Amino acid sequence: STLPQHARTPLIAAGVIGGLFILVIVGLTFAVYVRRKSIKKKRA
Amino acid sequence: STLPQHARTPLIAAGVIGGLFILVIVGLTFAVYVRRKSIKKKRA
Predict the structure, then answer these.
(1) Is B28 on the interface with A (CB under 8 A)?
(2) Cβ atoms < 10 Å from Cβ of A44
(3) Based on CB atoms within 10 Å of each CB, which residue in A12, A35, A39, B23 is the most buried?
(4) What is the 3-class SS of B1-44, one letter each residue?
């Protein structure tokens, strides 16, 4: 279906979406990569 | 994915741009925040 040439706010939308999604992967990747080590890290 | 009526690649464009730009700030912010400390950090 996708969106037409002139939609509500596709341009801006994609922008915010990318930054979030992209950050989600990178962020988690870091928190996960470290866990693989587990060396007296900060955990409650 | 396909394309809209009359548009090159605005949607996708903004997407890649956001993820990159957003990462640029966050990434640098980290490398900068640490530098402010300067305490036997990892540097070649």
Answers:
(1) no
(2) 2
(3) B23
(4) CCCCCCCCCHHHHHHHHHHHHHHHHHHHHHHHHHHCCCCCCCCC
**Method used for this model?**
NMR
| Interchain CB contact of B5 with A (< 8 Å) | yes
Instruction: Return d(Cα B26, Cα B30) in angstroms, integer.
Output: 6
Q: Each residue of A5-33: b (16+ CB within 10 Å) or e?
A: eeeeebeebbbeebbeebeeeeeeeeeee
Cβ distance A19 to B16 less than 8 Å, yes or no, reads no
Domain ranges, residue B17: 13-35
